Amino acid sequence: TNLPMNKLIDEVNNELSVAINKSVMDTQLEESMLYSLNAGGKRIRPVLLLLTLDSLNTEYELGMKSAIALEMIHTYSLIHDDLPAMDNDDYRRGKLTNHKVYGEWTAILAGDALLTKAFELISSDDRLTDEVKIKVLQRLSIASGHVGMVGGQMLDMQSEGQPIDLETLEMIHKTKTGALLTFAVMSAADIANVDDTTKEHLESYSYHLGMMFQIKDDLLDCYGDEAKSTYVSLLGKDGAEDKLTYHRDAAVDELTQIDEQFNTKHLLEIVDLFYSR
Amino acid sequence: TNLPMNKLIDEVNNELSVAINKSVMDTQLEESMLYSLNAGGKRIRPVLLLLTLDSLNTEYELGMKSAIALEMIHTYSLIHDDLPAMDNDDYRRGKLTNHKVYGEWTAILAGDALLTKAFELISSDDRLTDEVKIKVLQRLSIASGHVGMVGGQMLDMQSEGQPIDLETLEMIHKTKTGALLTFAVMSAADIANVDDTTKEHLESYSYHLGMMFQIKDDLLDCSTYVSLLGKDGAEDKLTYHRDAAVDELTQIDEQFNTKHLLEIVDLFYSR
């Protein structure tokens, strides 16, 4: 199907603006939740999940709640990441961070609530059977937990200001960043009920796509410095570009192995967006 | 069934001590998670869950994962509660708090991880059909989220150090503490597949039990029930709730032996 990226982003944004109902207890909790939820980003995680379903010949709206959940999980990690005991960021995308507007305690709890809400949302989605709902929930909890997204944050924070090797660096990005990405495509594969071998290719695809993400960003930070512990600091500039290209190629490779009844133009298009620059 | 309190607590403590495995990433996450999880206590929430499953003529072991999930939810909020930006506790029943042993950032992450693992645990439980997992899971997230446990904490923090009226104090208690306890009973009711009438009595019991619990605590400690009503007023409320809890227990279909649930109200009413 023809789905312009900006038209999906728009739909996601409309759903996210109205995804939490106003306070019954008269606190700022839900305006804090909504504040970060509406911060406005690129929304690649939800969009990835949506586009993956479309490539798999499945009604993309089946995955809207899962996509919303996914963005809630990403939002919550940011609110916690930004806190003074952690990254300590006062600004993100030109706006004040949650804790700068609401205090540390509101932000902690706004994070906790969003984590919780993500699970409520999937478990309540009537477009999916209970069997598929369990699969998505199981996958989200593993992707987000101690051996996924939060485990990577632990590893990242432990590594702060240390010269770690490349297996460590990759371990951090694979769990901290890649597990949500892999959730996006595999939750879709699960809603679509595609066959084991298509699942395998979508898996590798998602892994390589995920590794592209942070490499590109390290390169852009370096390209930026050229004009008037990371991938380029370990590998140098050309090593990083080589790494990027290798993941690009393995991603693109993996798509060409998906059986021909599925049209991957969308997935392939996301690879190129991650690759560009 | 004959299920002694001390034996169930012992089993629950053993399941919890092996509930999280060491991970390939080599950090303190799993250690911090387990540190707080083994801090031990009354374990009344998981115990409540198992006991009522048994009261409902159902294998209590069917709710063991749900019970462990419940205790994980309980301990994560304790980890977050004690943080300097919140209650700022350095001590909890004699032992140092999570963040004082492992630092603030680790403690925050141990909490997030525990929250997440609870939903993994119920998701993965093969003793339950997918249909009941969803029922339990949906209930856990509503009881723990912004209209439940965490919303209750919002209200509490927002009200810190100021005279709050009685209906506000009860709203805080109903959500901050009451929602989980009610989950312990209603999740068990869903696993057992008991009827609607039985559920309404159980819900009502759990509600009155929770209030009974909160009033008892304020009384034992000699804003609060005592400071608002005075000691005798607080004692009136305590007894009112004990009796309402028991009234609900006697209205339940007598195919179910409510003895264990009665033993709980009496354990905590008496001291």
Side-chain angles (χ1 to χ4, degrees), chain A residues 20-21 25-30 33 76 80 83 85-86 104-106 108-109 112-113 115-117 119-120 123-124 130-131 133-134 137-138 140-142 144-147 150-155 157-158 171 175, chain B residues 20-21 23-30 33 76 80 83 85-86 104-106 108-109 112-113 115-116 119-120 123-124 130-131 133-134 137-138 141-142 144-147 150-155 157-158 171 175:
Chain A
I20 308 299
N21 286 313
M25 274 183 276
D26 201 48
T27 58
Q28 311 180 304
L29 185 59
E30 20 283 297
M33 286 159 77
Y76 122 74
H80 283 24
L83 293 164
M86 212 109 64
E104 272 159 55
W105 63 264
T106 301
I108 292 159
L109 298 169
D112 293 353
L115 214 196
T116 320
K117 185 69 162 135
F119 292 103
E120 207 243 57
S123 70
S124 74
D130 291 349
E131 143 131 283
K133 275 191 250 214
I134 292 309
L137 278 153
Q138 211 174 157
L140 195 45
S141 62
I142 296 161
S144 303
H146 70 118
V147 308
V150 357
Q153 252 303 302
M154 266 294 294
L155 198 43
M157 292 280 128
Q158 190 172 97
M171 186 57 87
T175 53
Chain B
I20 295 137
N21 288 318
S23 126
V24 90
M25 304 177 77
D26 208 281
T27 51
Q28 294 188 128
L29 225 202
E30 287 74 30
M33 287 161 80
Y76 115 71
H80 280 192
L83 298 166
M86 304 241 266
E104 293 177 49
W105 57 265
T106 292
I108 292 149
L109 299 185
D112 296 343
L115 212 194
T116 315
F119 292 106
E120 205 228 271
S123 273
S124 81
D130 288 332
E131 115 138 87
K133 296 212 264 279
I134 289 300
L137 236 15
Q138 169 140 45
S141 54
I142 287 162
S144 300
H146 70 112
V147 312
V150 350
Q153 244 303 34
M154 257 303 119
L155 231 203
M157 285 293 309
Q158 191 175 91
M171 186 55 76
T175 51

Side-chain angles (χ1 to χ4, degrees), chain B residues 48-61:
Chain B
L48 189 41
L49 204 162
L50 305 159
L51 284 192
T52 116
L53 257 188
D54 189 83
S55 303
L56 293 179
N57 302 322
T58 301
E59 218 344 275
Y60 81 90
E61 290 280 354

Side-chain angles (χ1 to χ4, degrees), chain A residues 9 25-26 40 46 83 87 94 111 120 122 132 139 175 181 261:
Chain A
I9 295 182
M25 274 183 276
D26 201 48
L83 293 164
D87 282 321
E120 207 243 57
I122 285 151
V132 177
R139 195 185 291 280
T175 53
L181 287 174
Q261 98 191 62

Side-chain angles (χ1 to χ4, degrees), chain B residues 12-23:
Chain B
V12 161
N13 289 343
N14 292 318
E15 291 288 334
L16 284 168
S17 63
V18 302
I20 295 137
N21 288 318
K22 330 137 191 300
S23 126

Side-chain angles (χ1 to χ4, degrees), chain A residues 36-218:
Chain A
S36 301
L37 217 47
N38 293 131
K42 316 166 140 82
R43 312 289 194 202
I44 43 105
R45 288 158 189 84
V47 156
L48 188 50
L49 161 23
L50 271 8
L51 292 165
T52 302
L53 281 172
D54 192 67
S55 313
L56 267 17
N57 301 333
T58 294
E59 179 46 40
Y60 89 84
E61 290 283 354
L62 284 178
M64 188 67 228
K65 283 215 214 278
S66 291
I68 297 300
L70 186 44
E71 188 71 8
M72 271 171 195
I73 298 267
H74 166 73
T75 299
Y76 122 74
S77 68
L78 262 24
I79 294 155
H80 283 24
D81 287 350
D82 288 345
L83 293 164
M86 212 109 64
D87 282 321
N88 189 21
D89 315 303
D90 290 332
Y91 287 91
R92 187 181 287 271
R93 274 213 236 293
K95 287 195 155 149
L96 296 158
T97 49
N98 203 108
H99 66 100
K100 272 279 126 183
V101 178
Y102 294 105
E104 272 159 55
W105 63 264
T106 301
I108 292 159
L109 298 169
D112 293 353
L114 281 157
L115 214 196
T116 320
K117 185 69 162 135
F119 292 103
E120 207 243 57
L121 214 43
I122 285 151
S123 70
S124 74
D125 190 354
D126 283 342
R127 313 220 249 244
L128 324 171
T129 66
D130 291 349
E131 143 131 283
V132 177
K133 275 191 250 214
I134 292 309
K135 286 191 208 179
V136 179
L137 278 153
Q138 211 174 157
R139 195 185 291 280
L140 195 45
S141 62
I142 296 161
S144 303
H146 70 118
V147 308
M149 174 188 82
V150 357
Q153 252 303 302
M154 266 294 294
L155 198 43
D156 208 4
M157 292 280 128
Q158 190 172 97
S159 296
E160 188 148 83
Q162 309 285 257
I164 48 153
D165 63 35
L166 189 66
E167 11 206 274
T168 300
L169 215 246
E170 284 173 318
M171 186 57 87
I172 292 161
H173 291 136
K174 168 210 201 4
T175 53
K176 173 155 127 120
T177 295
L180 293 197
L181 287 174
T182 296
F183 170 79
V185 351
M186 297 311 286
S187 74
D190 275 348
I191 291 150
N193 190 219
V194 291
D195 77 316
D196 290 302
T197 133
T198 301
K199 277 178 190 181
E200 173 271 310
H201 296 106
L202 283 160
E203 256 245 60
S204 317
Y205 160 84
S206 79
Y207 167 80
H208 293 296
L209 180 73
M211 302 309 302
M212 295 182 61
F213 195 123
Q214 286 301 321
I215 300 170
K216 180 232 233 244
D217 255 70
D218 281 331

